[PDB]
Design an enzyme around this catalytic site. Structure first.
Site, PDB file in Angstrom:
ATOM      1  N   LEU A 166       0.826  -1.208   0.000  1.00  0.00           N
ATOM      2  CA  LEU A 166       0.000   0.000   0.000  1.00  0.00           C
ATOM      3  C   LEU A 166       0.861   1.260   0.000  1.00  0.00           C
ATOM      4  O   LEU A 166       0.583   2.237   0.697  1.00  0.00           O
ATOM      5  CB  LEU A 166      -0.962   0.005   1.187  1.00  0.00           C
ATOM      6  CG  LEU A 166      -2.000  -1.106   1.278  1.00  0.00           C
ATOM      7  CD1 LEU A 166      -2.853  -0.899   2.511  1.00  0.00           C
ATOM      8  CD2 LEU A 166      -2.860  -1.137   0.029  1.00  0.00           C
ATOM      9  N   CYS A 167       1.928   1.225  -0.789  1.00  0.00           N
ATOM     10  CA  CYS A 167       2.855   2.344  -0.874  1.00  0.00           C
ATOM     11  C   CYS A 167       3.198   2.597  -2.340  1.00  0.00           C
ATOM     12  O   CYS A 167       4.341   2.860  -2.707  1.00  0.00           O
ATOM     13  CB  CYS A 167       4.103   2.068  -0.038  1.00  0.00           C
ATOM     14  SG  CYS A 167       4.960   0.543  -0.479  1.00  0.00           S
TER      15      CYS A 167
END
Lengths: 109, 53, 132, 281, 137
Positions: free
Chosen positions: A77-78
């Site tokens: 999630l980056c």
């Protein structure tokens, strides 16, 4: 598309929005901490850099083996943080191993 | 706030049955399917230990 | 003599690119005082005390665990230390306690590798109790 | 009953002598739907007296124009007319028009109407909100958040909108001032997340300045009211439009940027703000 | 109607309870994974969970206004922040018994006077602190 279906989708996306906002807040706090000590880490790393900064050293022509240290986290999630590093590693292992240098990769992350 | 506005509840993501609900369903299974294997192997080791003793 | 000095740790940053007269450093293979134009010498540190003789005249004193004394050809010395600690925060009573405890452990350290580890402990403790 | 007593205590309606300023027309819910439907017309006629016969500028306060719409729908249902979409009366638009179009500006005078609006199911697209909005000319949004900040009156400045807010009508200076104070609060709200995440010291110098000016403006919006003077202890102020424009343009220009923020809170004209700043400590 | 329908003591405690609980609702989303949050947020979440445990009432167990005021006083002042979340209801019950039996005079004051006078607040503070110190066993 019953009102039931529309309601279900709307509620789900609302929950997703709330969770993502809270996650943004937590990531913001962690980033604030990580930027804070990045300044102390910076000059310390520059100390390591100074070695080849002043004593300019280059690989002679070729090495029998090679090590690729791709650093990253285990949490996604980056965006492309991990993806970009993996791409660079793949480009290098493609760039190397043509000359015969046996590249090895330590996957921190 | 105003009660009239649609209010979401816990489980709505799975209740929807959309892609995000399916992702949550599969993700839970993948984790605990692996955990059960570790737990089952540990139980097998425990059984072998008590068989030895 | 206009010698930029960078003493930094992973946690805290001390003098950074600051002109200093002398920096006595607890380096391995003997301690050598960093000068204005000392010969470029990449030498690893040992547990001990670093004294930075700031050009103003005062000499700050810090304790160093280990690292590299990266003095370049120019007047730039990069003193990276894994644990850069000031002398005040160190506890002398527990310093002596640890020294004596490690000295006792020396005999019990049957393994030469383990005895070497306790030797590192006693060396650090020796420098420590000298500091305190 | 609460409104009646509160109005009496405020002084807008005086029982001892003829100093009253409001006429009350009550259409309480226990009355049949037709009565509730026609109460608005009753009050409108009572206002019409002053506009035509007395040539005055009347203020008709219709609470929950939504209940007027609902009463009309109920009356239509009782009469048996086939309900329209969502179930409102088939003549919703015409009934609303008949009621609203009498609230206009004639040669003799004008009747302005401050109508409270209820939004069913929080749907602005609902027929009753839509039909009422068709006749609206300005919106006043009393927000609980602005009340929490302590700004009274608790009008949300950004959300509140008017249709005469166009240079050709209000005046170029008025439009410039209102537009400026709009932006000065919008950017303050936008960066209010930035300060909340990074920090106030993590803002730019101008970002620090706009916060101060916006905080001055949001405080300057608050104005003591004469009706609540007895309770609050602070004399109410009636700021002229010229004074409001002058004060807000002065704050936007940065003329009183040195002044403390508290100086602009619960004050009238900007002279009162600077005088209060003097009074402090 | 609002506070106009509340006893002055209940007004005094309930206003603060309302503000704290509203703030907790504002920050309730973080709670799930709010360990890495600002200390203010953590304080809000703790006070919220304590107050929420306080509000819970058993069925067919109507409480008197004075007892409710005592419990809410225990919560809002912050004597229960240290106490473990599950322990909050147990403390509520035990404190109710203690104040009802040992200190019925103070409940009478709240019941009769209808407000938490300064002396009552001091006395209430002493009682709550003393029992809280000994409550855990």
């Amino acid at each position: 598309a019953t009102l039931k279906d529309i309601t279900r989708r709307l509620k789900s996306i609302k929950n997703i929005q709330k969770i993502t906002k809270s996650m943004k807040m937590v990531a913001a706090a962690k980033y604030a901490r990580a930027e804070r000590d990045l300044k102390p880490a910076r000059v310390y790393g520059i100390g390591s850099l100074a070695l080849y900064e002043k004593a300019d050293i280059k690989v002679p022509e070729d090495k029998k083996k090679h090590l690729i240290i791709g650093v990253s986290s285990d949490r996604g999630l980056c965006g492309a943080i991990h993806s970009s590093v993996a791409k660079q590693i793949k480009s290098e292992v493609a760039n190397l191993t043509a000359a015969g240098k046996e590249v090895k990769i330590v996957g921190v992350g | 706030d105003t009660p009239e506005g649609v209010r979401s509840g816990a489980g709505a993501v799975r209740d929807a049955g959309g892609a995000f609900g399916k992702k949550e369903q599969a993700d839970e299974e993948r984790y605990f399917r692996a955990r059960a294997r570790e737990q089952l192997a540990a139980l097998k080791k425990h059984h072998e230990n008590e068989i030895s003793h | 003599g206009q010698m930029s000095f960078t003493f930094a740790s992973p946690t805290q940053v001390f003098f950074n690119g600051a002109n200093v007269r002398q920096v006595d450093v607890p380096t391995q293979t003997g301690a050598f005082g960093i000068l204005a134009s000392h010969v470029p010498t990449l030498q690893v540190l040992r547990p001990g005390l670093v004294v930075v003789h700031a050009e103003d005249g005062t000499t700050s004193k810090y304790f160093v665990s280990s690292g590299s004394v990266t003095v370049n050809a120019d007047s730039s010395v990069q003193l990276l230390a894994e644990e850069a600690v000031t002398l005040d925060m160190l506890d002398p009573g527990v310093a002596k306690a640890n020294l004596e405890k490690a000295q006792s452990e020396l005999l019990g350290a049957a393994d030469e590798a383990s005895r070497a580890e306790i030797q590192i402990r006693i060396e650090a403790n020796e420098a420590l109790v000298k500091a305190l | 009953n609460d409104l009646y007593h509160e109005m009496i205590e405020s002084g807008v309606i005086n029982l001892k002598d003829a100093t009253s300023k409001v006429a009350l027309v009550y259409g309480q819910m226990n009355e049949p739907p037709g009565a509730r439907a026609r109460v608005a017309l009753t009050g409108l006629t009572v206002a019409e007296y002053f506009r035509d016969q007395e040539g005055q500028d009347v203020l008709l306060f219709i609470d929950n124009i939504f209940r007027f719409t609902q009463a009309g729908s109920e009356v239509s249902a009782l009469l048996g007319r086939i309900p329209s979409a969502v179930g409102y009366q088939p003549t919703l638009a015409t009934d609303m028009g008949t009621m609203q179009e009498r609230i206009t500006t004639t040669k003799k005078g004008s009747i302005t109407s401050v109508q409270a609006i209820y939004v069913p199911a929080d749907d602005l697209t609902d027929p009753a909100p839509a039909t009422t909005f068709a006749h609206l000319d300005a919106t006043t949004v009393l927000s609980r958040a602005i009340a929490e900040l302590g700004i009274y009156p608790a009008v949300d400045p950004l959300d509140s909108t008017s249709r005469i807010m166009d240079p050709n009508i209000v005046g170029s200076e008025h439009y410039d001032v209102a537009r400026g104070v709009q932006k000065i609060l919008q950017d303050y709200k936008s960066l209010q997340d930035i300060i909340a995440i990074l920090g106030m010291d993590e803002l730019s110098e101008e970002d620090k300045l706009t916060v101060s000016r916006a905080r001055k403006i949001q405080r300057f919006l608050s104005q003591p009211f004469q009706v609540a003077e007895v309770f609050t202890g602070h004399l109410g102020k009636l700021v002229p439009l010229k004074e409001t424009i002058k004060g807000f343009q002065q704050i936007l220009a940065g003329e009183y940027d040195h002044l403390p923020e508290q100086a602009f809170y619960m004050v009238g004209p900007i002279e009162e703000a600077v005088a209060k700043a003097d009074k402090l400590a | 109607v609002g506070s106009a329908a509340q006893t002055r003591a209940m007004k005094q405690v309930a206003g603060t309870m309302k503000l704290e609980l509203a703030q907790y609702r504002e920050v309730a989303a973080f709670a799930q994974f709010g360990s890495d949050l600002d200390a203010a947020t953590q304080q809000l979440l703790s006070r919220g969970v304590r107050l929420t445990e306080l509000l819970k009432q058993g069925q067919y167990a109507p409480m008197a206004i004075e007892e409710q005021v005592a419990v809410i006083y225990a919560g809002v002042r912050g004597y229960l922040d240290k106490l473990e979340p599950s322990k909050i209801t147990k403390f509520e019950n035990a404190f109710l018994s203690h104040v009802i039996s040992q200190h019925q005079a103070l409940l009478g004051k709240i019941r009769a006077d209808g407000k938490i006078s300064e002396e009552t607040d001091a006395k209430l503070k002493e009682i709550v602190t003393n029992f809280l110190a000994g409550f855990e066993a």
